[PDB]
Amino acid sequence: KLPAGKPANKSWFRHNLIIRRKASYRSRWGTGAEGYGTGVPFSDQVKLHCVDNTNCKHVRLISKATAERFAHCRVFPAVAHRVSVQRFVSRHRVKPGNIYWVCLLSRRQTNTRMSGLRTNFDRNTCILMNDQRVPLGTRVMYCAGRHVNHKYHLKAVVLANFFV
Amino acid sequence: RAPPVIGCTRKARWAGIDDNPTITYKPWDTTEPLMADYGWTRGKLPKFRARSPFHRQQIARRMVTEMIRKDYCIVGGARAPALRILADHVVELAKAGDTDSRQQLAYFLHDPLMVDKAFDEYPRRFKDMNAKYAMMTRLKSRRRTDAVAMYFVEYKNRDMSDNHKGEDYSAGPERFFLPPRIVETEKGIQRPPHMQMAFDRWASKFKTEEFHHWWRLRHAKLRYWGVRNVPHPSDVDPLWTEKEEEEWHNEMLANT
Amino acid sequence: PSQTMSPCSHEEEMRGYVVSRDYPLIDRLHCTRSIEELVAQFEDRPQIESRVAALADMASTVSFRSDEELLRMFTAISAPFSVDGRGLNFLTVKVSKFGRPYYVPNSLLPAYVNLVDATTIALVREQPWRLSASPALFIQVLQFMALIKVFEPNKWFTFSDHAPSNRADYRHAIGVNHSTAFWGTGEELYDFMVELLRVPTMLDLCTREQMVDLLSGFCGVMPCGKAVGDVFKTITDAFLRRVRNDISGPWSAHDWAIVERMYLVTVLCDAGNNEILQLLLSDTASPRGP
Amino acid sequence: GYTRERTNRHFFVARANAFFSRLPIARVQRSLAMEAVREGRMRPWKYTKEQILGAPVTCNFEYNPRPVRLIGTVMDAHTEETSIKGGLKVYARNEETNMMLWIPPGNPKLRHEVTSTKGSFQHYLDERDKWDEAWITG
Amino acid sequence: TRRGGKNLAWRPKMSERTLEQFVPLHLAFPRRHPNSWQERQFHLLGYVKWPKEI
Amino acid sequence: RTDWYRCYPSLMREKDRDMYHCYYPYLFDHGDKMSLYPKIPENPREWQPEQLQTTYDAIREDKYDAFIRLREKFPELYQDTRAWDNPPPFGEFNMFYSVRFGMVGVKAFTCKDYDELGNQFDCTAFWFPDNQVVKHSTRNGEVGTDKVYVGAMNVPVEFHKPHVAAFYKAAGVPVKHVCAGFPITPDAYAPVGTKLDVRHFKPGQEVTITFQNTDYGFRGVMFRHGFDGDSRWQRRPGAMGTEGQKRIYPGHRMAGQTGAAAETYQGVPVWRIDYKNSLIYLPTLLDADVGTYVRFSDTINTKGLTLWNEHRGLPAFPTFIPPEDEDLSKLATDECQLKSPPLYMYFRDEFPATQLVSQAD
Amino acid sequence: YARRPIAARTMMDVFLAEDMSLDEIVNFGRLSLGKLQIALNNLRVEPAQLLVDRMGISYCEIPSLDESDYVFAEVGGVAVTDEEAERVAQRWAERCE
Amino acid sequence: DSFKEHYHRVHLPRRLALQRYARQQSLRNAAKGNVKAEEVPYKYNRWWVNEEHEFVHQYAFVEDPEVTKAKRETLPPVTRENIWKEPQQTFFLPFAPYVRVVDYPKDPDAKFLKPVNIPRWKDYMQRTKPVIPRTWY
Amino acid sequence: APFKSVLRRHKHHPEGLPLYNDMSKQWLCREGERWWLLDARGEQLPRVAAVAAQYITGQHRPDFTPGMITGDHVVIVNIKDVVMVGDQWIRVPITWQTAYPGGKYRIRLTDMYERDPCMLMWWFLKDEVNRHFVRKLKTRIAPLEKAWLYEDSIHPHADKNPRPLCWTDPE
Amino acid sequence: LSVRTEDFFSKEAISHARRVSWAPHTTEKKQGAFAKLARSNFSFAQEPYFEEEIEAHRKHHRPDVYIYKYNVSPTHFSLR
Amino acid sequence: TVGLLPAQLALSRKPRLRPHVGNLKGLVYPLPYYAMWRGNHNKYTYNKSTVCLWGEGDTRSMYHQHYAHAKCPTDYGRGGREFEYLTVKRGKMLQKPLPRVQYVAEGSKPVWLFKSWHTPLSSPSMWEREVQYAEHTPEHIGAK
RNA sequence: GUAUAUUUAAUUUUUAUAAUUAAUAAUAAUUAAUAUAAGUACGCAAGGAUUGAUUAUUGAAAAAAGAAAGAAGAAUAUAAUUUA
C-alpha cells in the first residue's frame, strides 16, 4: 500500500496516458455510428496492418488511446510484430523488435465525420514512421483518411496517393 | 454530433417518446396482426406475467382460442388489453379473408374449427365496423385467489353475429356444457348446424359417466392437496342425470 | 365575413366583456359588467368558482367604479366573514404527508388578495384624492380591511387556534412558503390612510359618526386591537373639539349615543378620555346607553 | 436527503402531445426536404428497395485539395421517398481499399448521384458477398 | 476537492494572495475607540474641562 | 474547465474614488448645484486647522472651462465624452442593463440540417404555441424583482384544475396550459395579454433551454454515476494521528431515482426560425421526451462579452411586434424562414487552412 | 369570452366551372353564405330554407386560398430565369391544349 | 434551525418592516400634496483611473416608475425591419483585425512603407476591449 | 407523563417556525413588557451584548423566574458604530460548521460586519443567551426574538416610546 | 457595426488632474515627445494622498490678510 | 476578417466564461462579472454599513485632510471588496446643472491657446491657461 | 477493514409561479498538434524564443400550496380515424 497512512491507486501515470469515459447513462463510448465523438480509441496491444514497402507487415500499438479524432495531437508509438522476408535498404531492414511511430490510415470500426458521413474500412491500416515524422516506406498501398491531411503528417500526405 | 444518451436505453414504465436519432432494432415485423411484441413501452402490448415469452405466447393463443369459441372471456390483469388487441387482430385477419391470412390464423390458434368459424362469421359481423371490434369491461369483483382486477372481454355487434345472437352473459348457464342462456325475445334463434354438432359432441363427453368418476376423483385430489372447500367425494353428486338430461333436451328443442 | 354565425338565444349570448383595443397584439379581456349584476351573481350563486369570478371582475373594474358602487361592492363582499372568526380562512384540502397536516386554502383567498391589491392601486397609486374626498369610502375600506385580517395573514392559513400557522410570516431558502409568505396585502393602503389622517381636511369633512367609525376601524384593523398613537390622538382631539363646539347648540340622544360609542372605542383601544367620561357622568338630561 | 432529483412542478410535468395535432410535423419536414431540393443539395427520389438495390452510385466529396471521387453500389436505403431523414449505403472499392460508407442526403459537400436508372439484385448479391469476404479477411 | 464550504458569501473561491489586499489593517471604520476612553485620553493629554464661560 | 481568473474586471477600491483619479472633472454635490469644490460648511466653527476652504481654484476652473469648451465645439472629436453629461434615457434598450423575458415552446420533433459548409447539425425543432404575457410580478417594488409570466398554449376551460382556471380568470388572459416566469428589468415590461411571435429571438443568438429530462426510473450506480479529499493522515512516520470516516458523507454517488429533472442547457446557439409555423430549430439534441414544455431565455453574456451589442446586433426590445401590412396567412412556409450564419468557421471534417497541408480555392 | 358550440361535423366543398373567374367565385360564395346566414336567422320553400331544414346543413364558409404551392425561383441550385419559366409554361400549355 | 437560518427567519419580516417605514416616508411626502415621486441624484463621478493606471467605469442605472408604468400599459413600437430580417452574427470579429497583406507599397517586403493606420499584431492581441473613454462595444 | 410529539415543526415544513413574540403560551407574558432604546455608539460589542441580554432575558426584574420567559424589548441602534477594543475587529474569529466533511466556516468579525452588523450583534446576544440558558430551545430562542437590532439610527418602533437604556461600566 | 481606428488604437488612461489639456494634440502621452525627439521607442501608492494645489502666483505670495479668526484670501479661506 | 481564425463563441469545448450560471440568484444583468469580486454572488445587498478604510462608506462623517477636500461626502459608497461596479436604484433621475465658471464677464470673447506636445513641456506656454479672458489679464503689471 | 442503529441516496405522485437568507458539483485542468506574430525580440555566429486563437480531452441539472387504494397507456406509438 502506498502512500502508507492513505493508500492511493498505483495507476496514476496510466490515467494520464489513457483517455477514459465514465460509463454512465449520460456518458458512454458509442459504437461510432451515432455521431462525432462516439467510438473508442484503440488499446495498447491492438495489432494492425502496416501498408508500405517496408518489410514490416503487422504492428502492435503502444499508445493507450489511438483514434483518428486526435491523430494529430498525439504520438502513436508501435512495435513491428510479424515482419516479412525476402529471397535475394532501411525500409527492408525492419525487425520484429524495433519500435517506430505510426500514422493512422483507416479504422475497421465505424468512423463518423462531423459532416454526417459514416465509413467502415476493412483493415486497420498504418505506416511506419521515424522519430522525425518521416515514413520509412517509399509509398503506400491503402487509402488514408481526412485526419491524415494535417500538417503533422506532411510526408504521409505526400506519399499516400488517395484519401477518403 | 451525437445525442447525450447513446444507444437503446430502457426508460421508465410511463415515459414519453423522443425522436432522437438512434439505431432502432425490432425483433421481427411487429406490424403483423398476430405477431406482436409484449412490453411496457407505449408501442408494445402489455406483457402479463409468464414464465417465459414462449409461455406468454401460449397464454395468448389460449385466450384468443377461448374468445373465438365463446366471444365473451373473463381474464385477469394485464392480459385483458392484450386479449382485446389480439381479438381485434383476428377480426382484421377474418375481414381480410386472404388464404395467407387464414393460414396465419390456423398457425396461431389451437382449433381449426374455431379458425373456420371466425373466418366465416366475423367478415359479415364487422363489415360495417371500422376499428374497434372487442370491448373490455372492468368487473368490480376481484378474484379472491390473488386479488387481481378482472376484465370481461367481449365481441361487438352480437346481433349481427350469426351463431352468437341473443346470448346474454349476465349469468352463466346451469352447466358449463349446456348452451348459453338466450334472451327471452331472441329465443327462436337457430345456430349453424356445424357449430351445433361440434358443441353436442363436446358436451356428450361430460354427459358420460366416466366424467362423473373423474369429477369425484378431482374432489379427492383437491382434498388431498389442500383446497379447503372441496366436499367429500361421498357427498358430491353427479353434474348430469337422466331427469336433468331430458329437461335440458326439452329446453334445447324449445330454443332451437 | 368568413363563415356563418350560428344563431343563439339572448340568454346564451356571451356578454359583459370587451377585448382590449389592440386586439391583434393585446388580446386581454376586460369586464364592463355592472357592479349591481356582479353583486347579484355573488349573492345568488354561492359557488366558490362563481364568487372567484365575481371578485376577479370587481378587481378588474375597481378603477372604473364610483364611491357608491364601491360601497355596495364592499358591503356585498363582507357577508361571509365574522368579527371573531378568521377572515380569508378558506381552508379546503388537508395535506399530511410529513406528519403534521397543513391546510391549503382554496381559490377564494387569492381572489380577495387580488381585490385588495386592485383597491390599493386604484385608491393610492392612481386616484389618491378619492379617499380624501369621500369619507364614507374611507370608512368602508377600513371596515372591510378590519373584517378580513389583512395584518394577521397567519389566520388565513391557521386551521385551529391551538396550532396557529406561520405560512404568511415564514420563508426558507429551499422553497417552503415561497408563494404564501410576505405578501404586502393592505400595507401600502393602510400606510396611505395613516398619512392622510396625519397630514386635516378629511376630519373637517367627516361627521362625528364617521369619525367614530373611522377610529373603530383603525383599532380593529390593527392586529393588537389598538390604533396607532398619532392617529388615535388626532381623531380624539378632533372629536373633542367638535363635541365642545356643538354641545352648546342643539343636542340629541343620538349625539349622546355617538359620544358613548367614542368613549367605548377609546377604552377598547386601551386609552381613556377623562374629559368624555366626566362629561357623560355630569350630564343628566338623557339616560345613558349600553 | 440534502438534494432532490425529481421535479413535480406543473410546467415540467405538463406535456403537449395532446395538442400536437395543431402543428403538422410531416408537412414541415416535407417543406424542409423541398427547400433542400431547391437549394440543390439533393434531388428528389422515389424508389423502392428492390428497385434501388445494386444500382451504381458516383460519390464526389468536395474535400480539399483534390475532391474524392468514388464509384460504388447501393447496399441499402433508409427511406423509399424524398425526406431529410434519409441516407444511403455504398460500398466503394478502390485499388486495394474496400470501404462501406453511409452517406446522408442534403449535404452540400457530399454530392452523391445514383448514376443508373435501375439496379440489379444479382449485382447487389455478389457485391455484398465481396464485402463480406473482405470484412472477414480483415 | 473539498466536499463542503461552498457558500461563496463566507468562503469565497479566491486565493489568500487575492484576499490579502482586501484584508484591512488601518481599519478606519468601524472605529476601535470606546466612548469610555475619551475622558481618559483627554486627561492623559492633560487638557482640562474649563467652565463654559472660560 | 473554469477560468474565473480570466473572469475579473479591472479591480478598483473606493478609497481610490478620489478627485485625482476621476477620468473626467470631479464634481461635488451642493444640493441643487454641482460644484468643483467641497461644500464649505455654513458654520465656520466647523472648519478644521490646516483645512483650506477653496472658493476659486484657478487650475480647476481653467481646466474645466477648457474641457467644456472643447466638448461643446468639437462634438465629433469628443463624442466618447458625451455619456458623462448626457446619460442614456431609461426605457430604451441598454447593453449592460436591459434583460428581456423569454418564451415557452413545445419540443416539436428532431431533424438534421447542414451549414453552408459540410457541417451537419442534429437539430431539435421546438414549437411555440400561442404565447402571451400572462402576468407581471414584483415583491413589493424591490429593485430587480420584476418578473414577467408568459403563457404557453391555449387550453379549454375543463382542462385545468379549478385553482388554475381561477388564476387565469383573475388574470383575464386566455387560459394557457403552461405558464413560465422570467426575471426582467422594468424597461423590458410588456402589457399583459401581449402576443409573442417566434421572431422575438434571432437566428444566430444564444438561448438558454430549460426542460425536463426523460424519466429513467430508479437505476443503480452503474447506470447513474457509473464508472466500470483527505481528512487527517500522517505524511511522515514522525507521529500517529488520523481521523477515519465514521459515517456516509452527504456527497456520495449512490443508487437512486435518475430521470425527470429540470435541466438547463446554457448558451445553445439558435439555428433556424420558422415564424409561419412558429418553430425554432436548435442544433442540439435534448434528453427529453416529445411534448415537454421547454423554456427559452436569452443568454446575457458569453466569453466575457454581451450577446446584444452593436457589433453583433440588437434585439426587438421588449419583444417582436409584427408590422400591420404583413399577413402570415398570405405567406407560404418557405417564405417565412430565417437561417442563421455558420456557427463554425471551417469544414470540421478537414482542418483550418492554417493546419491544412493543401487547400483548394 | 368564448366561441359558440360546434355547428358542423362533416364538410363538403362546392366548386363552380373552372372557367369562372376569381371575382365570380368570390361573389357566388359570398351570396351563398349570406343567404344561408339569413335562412338560419329566420329559422331561429326557397333553396336556402330547404338546405337549412331538410338537408340539415348548418354551416358554410369561404376558406382562404391554398398558398402552400412553391414559388420555384431555383431548381437544383440553378436560378430559374424568367425567359426559361415562360418557355416552360408555354410548353405545358401547348401540351395541355 | 441553524444560527443564520434563525437570524434570517426572525429578521426578514423586520427588514420588510424597515423598508415599509422607508416607503412610508415618501408616502407621507406624497399624501401631503407633493405627488412628485422621490428623485435620486445623478452621479457624474463614474469614470476612474485605478491605482494601476487602468480605466474603470461604474455602471449606474436608475429605474423610472413613470417609464415602467408606461411600458406595462402601452404597446411598444413596431419592430424595425432590419432587426427581424438580419441575423445575430455568431462570431465577434476582432476590434483591431490584423492584415499583413497590403498592395500599396511596391516590393511589399519593405516594412518601413506599411501604412500606419492598419493595426499591428500587438494591437490586434491587446485590443480586447473598447477604447478607453468608451464603454459600449 | 408529559409526551412531546415526535412530529415536530421543522424548518422544511410549510407550517414553518413560529415567532415567540406573537405566540401565546403559559410561560409567555408580554403584559409587563417594557421597551428600551440602547444606542451602541462607541460601546464595546461584548459589553453592549451583555447589557442588552440582561434586559432581554428578563434577569433585570426582581420577579424573575427561570421557567417564565418574560423580558423587556430592547431596540439596539447605531450597531454600525459599535466599537471593538483593538485589533479584535480582524483578530477575533467566528466559527460555524455544516454537516458536510469540509463543512467548517472560519470568518472574521470584519466579514460579519461587512455582510450585516446586526448579524454580529445577534451572534453575541445568542452567545450570552446560550451562556445563561442552553438546555431548552424555547428559552434559547424567545429572548433573541424579544431583541431588536438596527444598524442605523432609524427604527420603526417610535410608536412605543422606547426609553433610553442608561447603564454604567464596571470601571 | 464595422471596423474602425478608434477600435484599433487605445488612448492613455490618465486622470483629469494629471492631464495637462484635453486638446487633440495633447491627447497623446508625454513620453511621446521624448520618443519623437530621440527617434526611438521605449503606479499609485497604497495611500496616495495629495495636499490641494494652489495657483503658482497666489501660493508663492500669499497676503497676510486675516479676519476675526479666519484667514481671508481672494481665493481661499482658512482657520487660524 | 474572414481569412483569419476567430475565437469560437457559440460552440466550443473550451471553458465558456460564465461564472454566474450557478452562483447568482434571480435577475442577472448582462454586464459581465459585475458581482465577481464579491465572491461571485449577489446576496446580502441590503447592508448599508460595511468594512471601510479611510475615504470609504462610513468615513464620510469623519475628517481626513485628503478626502475632506478630494472627495464629496455624498460620493462615498461601499467597502473595498464590496465596491459598486453596478448599481440599480429606482427613482426619478435628477440631472443637476454643471458648475458655471465664475469671475468671467458676460459676452466676453476669450483667447484660445492651442496646447500641443510639439511645444516643449518646459515652456511656460504649456503651463499657461488654454481659455484666456480679457478680464483675467493684469493690465497694470503690463501683462497682455 | 468479519440491514439492525446512526448515516447517506432517492421518493412522499401536474406545485399556474425556482431564487430577499440557509446549505451545496467543477478556486490555472496542465498537457499535445498546427498556424499567426516572424522567420521578429535576442544572439559574435549557427541559431532563435515569450505568447490570449483552433483542435484534441464530449459533456452540459431549479426541493416543499389543491382534492388520489384500478392500466400516468382505455395500451396494437393519433387523448376518439369513419364505426354497427
mmCIF file with all atom_site columns, N, CA, C and O in Angstrom, chain I residues 97-121:
data_model
loop_
_atom_site.group_PDB
_atom_site.id
_atom_site.type_symbol
_atom_site.label_atom_id
_atom_site.label_alt_id
_atom_site.label_comp_id
_atom_site.label_asym_id
_atom_site.label_entity_id
_atom_site.label_seq_id
_atom_site.pdbx_PDB_ins_code
_atom_site.Cartn_x
_atom_site.Cartn_y
_atom_site.Cartn_z
_atom_site.occupancy
_atom_site.B_iso_or_equiv
_atom_site.pdbx_formal_charge
_atom_site.auth_seq_id
_atom_site.auth_comp_id
_atom_site.auth_asym_id
_atom_site.auth_atom_id
_atom_site.pdbx_PDB_model_num
ATOM 1   N N  . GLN I 1 97  ? -20.222 25.554 11.272 1.00 0.00 ? 97  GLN I N  1
ATOM 2   C CA . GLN I 1 97  ? -19.931 24.343 10.523 1.00 0.00 ? 97  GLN I CA 1
ATOM 3   C C  . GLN I 1 97  ? -21.211 23.718 9.993  1.00 0.00 ? 97  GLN I C  1
ATOM 4   O O  . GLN I 1 97  ? -22.272 23.823 10.611 1.00 0.00 ? 97  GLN I O  1
ATOM 5   N N  . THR I 1 98  ? -21.087 23.062 8.845  1.00 0.00 ? 98  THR I N  1
ATOM 6   C CA . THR I 1 98  ? -22.153 22.275 8.249  1.00 0.00 ? 98  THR I CA 1
ATOM 7   C C  . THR I 1 98  ? -21.852 20.790 8.423  1.00 0.00 ? 98  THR I C  1
ATOM 8   O O  . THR I 1 98  ? -20.734 20.395 8.760  1.00 0.00 ? 98  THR I O  1
ATOM 9   N N  . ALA I 1 99  ? -22.869 19.963 8.183  1.00 0.00 ? 99  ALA I N  1
ATOM 10  C CA . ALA I 1 99  ? -22.723 18.518 8.307  1.00 0.00 ? 99  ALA I CA 1
ATOM 11  C C  . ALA I 1 99  ? -21.796 17.919 7.258  1.00 0.00 ? 99  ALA I C  1
ATOM 12  O O  . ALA I 1 99  ? -21.435 16.744 7.383  1.00 0.00 ? 99  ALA I O  1
ATOM 13  N N  . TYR I 1 100 ? -21.409 18.675 6.237  1.00 0.00 ? 100 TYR I N  1
ATOM 14  C CA . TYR I 1 100 ? -20.522 18.165 5.206  1.00 0.00 ? 100 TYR I CA 1
ATOM 15  C C  . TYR I 1 100 ? -19.095 18.023 5.732  1.00 0.00 ? 100 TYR I C  1
ATOM 16  O O  . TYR I 1 100 ? -18.722 18.648 6.726  1.00 0.00 ? 100 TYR I O  1
ATOM 17  N N  . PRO I 1 101 ? -18.274 17.190 5.078  1.00 0.00 ? 101 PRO I N  1
ATOM 18  C CA . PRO I 1 101 ? -16.903 16.968 5.561  1.00 0.00 ? 101 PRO I CA 1
ATOM 19  C C  . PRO I 1 101 ? -16.079 18.242 5.645  1.00 0.00 ? 101 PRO I C  1
ATOM 20  O O  . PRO I 1 101 ? -15.483 18.530 6.688  1.00 0.00 ? 101 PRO I O  1
ATOM 21  N N  . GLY I 1 102 ? -16.017 19.001 4.551  1.00 0.00 ? 102 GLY I N  1
ATOM 22  C CA . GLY I 1 102 ? -15.363 20.294 4.586  1.00 0.00 ? 102 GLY I CA 1
ATOM 23  C C  . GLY I 1 102 ? -16.004 21.134 5.666  1.00 0.00 ? 102 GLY I C  1
ATOM 24  O O  . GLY I 1 102 ? -15.428 21.328 6.740  1.00 0.00 ? 102 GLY I O  1
ATOM 25  N N  . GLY I 1 103 ? -17.199 21.644 5.391  1.00 0.00 ? 103 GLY I N  1
ATOM 26  C CA . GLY I 1 103 ? -18.109 21.998 6.458  1.00 0.00 ? 103 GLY I CA 1
ATOM 27  C C  . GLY I 1 103 ? -17.778 23.248 7.242  1.00 0.00 ? 103 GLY I C  1
ATOM 28  O O  . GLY I 1 103 ? -18.675 24.039 7.538  1.00 0.00 ? 103 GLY I O  1
ATOM 29  N N  . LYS I 1 104 ? -16.516 23.403 7.635  1.00 0.00 ? 104 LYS I N  1
ATOM 30  C CA . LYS I 1 104 ? -16.143 24.407 8.622  1.00 0.00 ? 104 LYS I CA 1
ATOM 31  C C  . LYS I 1 104 ? -15.988 25.776 7.975  1.00 0.00 ? 104 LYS I C  1
ATOM 32  O O  . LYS I 1 104 ? -15.312 25.920 6.951  1.00 0.00 ? 104 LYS I O  1
ATOM 33  N N  . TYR I 1 105 ? -16.616 26.781 8.580  1.00 0.00 ? 105 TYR I N  1
ATOM 34  C CA . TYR I 1 105 ? -16.504 28.175 8.169  1.00 0.00 ? 105 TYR I CA 1
ATOM 35  C C  . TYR I 1 105 ? -15.816 28.937 9.292  1.00 0.00 ? 105 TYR I C  1
ATOM 36  O O  . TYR I 1 105 ? -16.357 29.038 10.401 1.00 0.00 ? 105 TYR I O  1
ATOM 37  N N  . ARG I 1 106 ? -14.624 29.453 9.004  1.00 0.00 ? 106 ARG I N  1
ATOM 38  C CA . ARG I 1 106 ? -13.926 30.390 9.873  1.00 0.00 ? 106 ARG I CA 1
ATOM 39  C C  . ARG I 1 106 ? -13.944 31.757 9.208  1.00 0.00 ? 106 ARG I C  1
ATOM 40  O O  . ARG I 1 106 ? -13.438 31.911 8.092  1.00 0.00 ? 106 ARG I O  1
ATOM 41  N N  . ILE I 1 107 ? -14.524 32.747 9.887  1.00 0.00 ? 107 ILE I N  1
ATOM 42  C CA . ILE I 1 107 ? -14.690 34.076 9.318  1.00 0.00 ? 107 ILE I CA 1
ATOM 43  C C  . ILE I 1 107 ? -14.275 35.103 10.362 1.00 0.00 ? 107 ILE I C  1
ATOM 44  O O  . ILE I 1 107 ? -14.116 34.794 11.544 1.00 0.00 ? 107 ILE I O  1
ATOM 45  N N  . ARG I 1 108 ? -14.079 36.336 9.909  1.00 0.00 ? 108 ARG I N  1
ATOM 46  C CA . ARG I 1 108 ? -13.662 37.427 10.775 1.00 0.00 ? 108 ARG I CA 1
ATOM 47  C C  . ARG I 1 108 ? -14.839 38.336 11.100 1.00 0.00 ? 108 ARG I C  1
ATOM 48  O O  . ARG I 1 108 ? -15.805 38.439 10.337 1.00 0.00 ? 108 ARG I O  1
ATOM 49  N N  . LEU I 1 109 ? -14.748 38.996 12.256 1.00 0.00 ? 109 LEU I N  1
ATOM 50  C CA . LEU I 1 109 ? -15.752 39.993 12.602 1.00 0.00 ? 109 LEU I CA 1
ATOM 51  C C  . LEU I 1 109 ? -15.859 41.052 11.519 1.00 0.00 ? 109 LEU I C  1
ATOM 52  O O  . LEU I 1 109 ? -16.936 41.615 11.308 1.00 0.00 ? 109 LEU I O  1
ATOM 53  N N  . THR I 1 110 ? -14.759 41.335 10.820 1.00 0.00 ? 110 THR I N  1
ATOM 54  C CA . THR I 1 110 ? -14.820 42.269 9.703  1.00 0.00 ? 110 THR I CA 1
ATOM 55  C C  . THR I 1 110 ? -15.766 41.766 8.621  1.00 0.00 ? 110 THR I C  1
ATOM 56  O O  . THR I 1 110 ? -16.581 42.531 8.095  1.00 0.00 ? 110 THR I O  1
ATOM 57  N N  . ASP I 1 111 ? -15.674 40.481 8.275  1.00 0.00 ? 111 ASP I N  1
ATOM 58  C CA . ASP I 1 111 ? -16.572 39.922 7.270  1.00 0.00 ? 111 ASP I CA 1
ATOM 59  C C  . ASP I 1 111 ? -18.011 39.902 7.767  1.00 0.00 ? 111 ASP I C  1
ATOM 60  O O  . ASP I 1 111 ? -18.943 40.220 7.015  1.00 0.00 ? 111 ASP I O  1
ATOM 61  N N  . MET I 1 112 ? -18.215 39.535 9.033  1.00 0.00 ? 112 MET I N  1
ATOM 62  C CA . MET I 1 112 ? -19.568 39.544 9.576  1.00 0.00 ? 112 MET I CA 1
ATOM 63  C C  . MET I 1 112 ? -20.165 40.943 9.531  1.00 0.00 ? 112 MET I C  1
ATOM 64  O O  . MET I 1 112 ? -21.349 41.103 9.217  1.00 0.00 ? 112 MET I O  1
ATOM 65  N N  . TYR I 1 113 ? -19.364 41.963 9.843  1.00 0.00 ? 113 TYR I N  1
ATOM 66  C CA . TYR I 1 113 ? -19.840 43.339 9.780  1.00 0.00 ? 113 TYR I CA 1
ATOM 67  C C  . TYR I 1 113 ? -20.128 43.761 8.345  1.00 0.00 ? 113 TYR I C  1
ATOM 68  O O  . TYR I 1 113 ? -21.153 44.396 8.075  1.00 0.00 ? 113 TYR I O  1
ATOM 69  N N  . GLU I 1 114 ? -19.240 43.418 7.410  1.00 0.00 ? 114 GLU I N  1
ATOM 70  C CA . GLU I 1 114 ? -19.447 43.801 6.020  1.00 0.00 ? 114 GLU I CA 1
ATOM 71  C C  . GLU I 1 114 ? -20.683 43.142 5.429  1.00 0.00 ? 114 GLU I C  1
ATOM 72  O O  . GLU I 1 114 ? -21.287 43.701 4.508  1.00 0.00 ? 114 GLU I O  1
ATOM 73  N N  . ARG I 1 115 ? -21.068 41.968 5.928  1.00 0.00 ? 115 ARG I N  1
ATOM 74  C CA . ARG I 1 115 ? -22.313 41.347 5.486  1.00 0.00 ? 115 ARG I CA 1
ATOM 75  C C  . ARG I 1 115 ? -23.517 41.971 6.190  1.00 0.00 ? 115 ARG I C  1
ATOM 76  O O  . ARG I 1 115 ? -24.437 42.467 5.533  1.00 0.00 ? 115 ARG I O  1
ATOM 77  N N  . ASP I 1 116 ? -23.531 41.945 7.522  1.00 0.00 ? 116 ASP I N  1
ATOM 78  C CA . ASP I 1 116 ? -24.598 42.590 8.276  1.00 0.00 ? 116 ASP I CA 1
ATOM 79  C C  . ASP I 1 116 ? -24.170 42.787 9.727  1.00 0.00 ? 116 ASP I C  1
ATOM 80  O O  . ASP I 1 116 ? -24.073 41.807 10.476 1.00 0.00 ? 116 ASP I O  1
ATOM 81  N N  . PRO I 1 117 ? -23.913 44.024 10.171 1.00 0.00 ? 117 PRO I N  1
ATOM 82  C CA . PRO I 1 117 ? -23.514 44.216 11.578 1.00 0.00 ? 117 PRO I CA 1
ATOM 83  C C  . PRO I 1 117 ? -24.539 43.695 12.568 1.00 0.00 ? 117 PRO I C  1
ATOM 84  O O  . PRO I 1 117 ? -24.174 43.137 13.616 1.00 0.00 ? 117 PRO I O  1
ATOM 85  N N  . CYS I 1 118 ? -25.824 43.864 12.258 1.00 0.00 ? 118 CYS I N  1
ATOM 86  C CA . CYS I 1 118 ? -26.862 43.315 13.116 1.00 0.00 ? 118 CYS I CA 1
ATOM 87  C C  . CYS I 1 118 ? -26.672 41.819 13.299 1.00 0.00 ? 118 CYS I C  1
ATOM 88  O O  . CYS I 1 118 ? -27.013 41.275 14.351 1.00 0.00 ? 118 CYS I O  1
ATOM 89  N N  . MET I 1 119 ? -26.112 41.145 12.294 1.00 0.00 ? 119 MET I N  1
ATOM 90  C CA . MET I 1 119 ? -25.811 39.724 12.427 1.00 0.00 ? 119 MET I CA 1
ATOM 91  C C  . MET I 1 119 ? -24.760 39.483 13.502 1.00 0.00 ? 119 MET I C  1
ATOM 92  O O  . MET I 1 119 ? -24.866 38.531 14.282 1.00 0.00 ? 119 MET I O  1
ATOM 93  N N  . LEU I 1 120 ? -23.735 40.334 13.559 1.00 0.00 ? 120 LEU I N  1
ATOM 94  C CA . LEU I 1 120 ? -22.711 40.201 14.592 1.00 0.00 ? 120 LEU I CA 1
ATOM 95  C C  . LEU I 1 120 ? -23.297 40.448 15.978 1.00 0.00 ? 120 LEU I C  1
ATOM 96  O O  . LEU I 1 120 ? -23.014 39.708 16.936 1.00 0.00 ? 120 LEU I O  1
ATOM 97  N N  . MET I 1 121 ? -24.121 41.489 16.106 1.00 0.00 ? 121 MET I N  1
ATOM 98  C CA . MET I 1 121 ? -24.768 41.744 17.389 1.00 0.00 ? 121 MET I CA 1
ATOM 99  C C  . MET I 1 121 ? -25.655 40.572 17.788 1.00 0.00 ? 121 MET I C  1
ATOM 100 O O  . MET I 1 121 ? -25.705 40.188 18.962 1.00 0.00 ? 121 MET I O  1
#
